Structure 1
């Protein structure tokens, strides 16, 4: 059973257990507060549990938004965001996804990202190409007019500066899956200078952007580095290229 066979299973299973919850704002209570502050809706937990029901038997560490960490001493740890974008999901906004990330000794091994309503498996092995349902995806070739980013800026962020250079603005309110929309050349880039995105949100899509050509810098335009934890919020800047990144970095 390969790592994707693992992930893919989990995601499909999760798919069926929780789709009748999409929009159903009346069907979901909160079951508790998680490490990062965020509230765990029952839809959230339920998804993470199916994940836990598979990775439980194996000897591996776990990182997972709701539940937090579960160190098992292995040179293998998985990072799952059981639902990337609980909001959109409960408010019937069709921008959610499942995030599965595997790390051998804190190093990129294989990232799974499943966007439920498209049936789109975004996955990629460390050094082996980033794909889309098989099809070979890669970031987009920059265009100094046709830029199309999605942002989550800070107060100090000059907005008019940005918006004048950007050709199209989108903001789908799920940063992981938005990364993958960079992964395939849809989006030119997507940042978040308002430290919110935790490890568990960007893990699986970290690995895929890498294997697709994205840059994935931090605030000061430096090679983003992070720790495997369901805590600590950080500044990420996934991008299309230098030039793009260039553009971003300054406006901040």
Structure 2
């Protein structure tokens, strides 16, 4: 079947199985450490294994957080984060999402980011446009008297310059999903020059943001490029306009 039908499949199965853990630290506990020297909790495992209970059957290349890279030679590669923003999850902050990115020869083909709590499918086939539960969605027109943003800054930033230059701040702690908010028009931009994000966090939303009219760029301003691997953090900037990108490039 088609990719959106497979992504949404896995999405909704992870959903039923991991939502009762939502906010219930009493029930979760560490179960391993990820190759990235990170702690894996029981709900991450459960959610990754489900996804893998499906994806292995497709004989493609799966690429995930707590598991690194499984090469099968395919022209196809699934980049997944079964749960983006697990801290929030385990702690009852309602901002997490399933991230599933389909690549055909390392070029974007299909992207899906599912926001469990609000039952929202954000998807885009490469070249086909960006949708939110069947409706097109677009980066919002720039208004410098109405900048709303979310950022992940380094020591290298003048935060007050920033705070001065924008109007609102939101900082949700799930990069993948924040990218989708740039895509749907809520945010003027999100970024992380404090290099922590990785391909498993931005792949699926990459595609979606691009088709949304977004300007995805690196530290410097040229189009962002990335390798598919569970390792490698990367600076990223996801603004809705040349102007917006400026202001942000204007501080780092």
Place the TM-score, normalised by the shorter chain, in its bin.
over 0.9
The aligned counterpart of 1:171 is 171
**Any idea what the Cα deviations from partners look like across 1:61-83, whole Å, max 9, x if unmatched?**
01001111100000000000010
Any conservation in 2 of the 1:45–1:82 contact (CA below 8 Å)? no
**Any idea what the Cα deviations from partners look like across 1:132-184, whole Å, max 9, x if unmatched?**
00011011100011000001100111100000011100000000000000011
> 2: distance between equivalents of 1:233 and 1:36?
10
The aligned counterpart of 2:83 is 83
Give SS of 2:148's match. Answer: coil
Say yes or no: does 1:210 pair with 2:210.
yes
How far is 1:98 from its partner?
0.2
Aligned residue pairs, count: 252
The aligned counterpart of 2:36 is 36
Give SS of 2:78's match. Answer: strand
Paired residues for 1:148-227 under 5 Å: 148-227=148-227
> 2: distance between equivalents of 1:222 and 1:67?
31
**Any idea what the Cα deviations from partners look like across 1:82-117, whole Å, max 9, x if unmatched?**
100010000000000000000001000000000000
> 2: distance between equivalents of 1:166 and 1:223?
23
**Any idea what the Cα deviations from partners look like across 1:2-56, whole Å, max 9, x if unmatched?**
1010000100000000000100011111111112232111101111111001111
Q: More strand by proportion, 1 or 2?
A: 2
The runs of 5 or more residues in structure 2 that have no matched partner are none
Give SS of 2:171's match. Answer: coil
Give SS of 1:100's match. Answer: strand
Give SS of 1:178's match. Answer: helix
How far is 1:218 from its partner?
0.2
Give SS of 1:83's match. Answer: strand
Any conservation in 2 of the 1:36–1:232 contact (CA below 8 Å)? no
Aligned alpha-carbon RMSD (Å)? 0.6
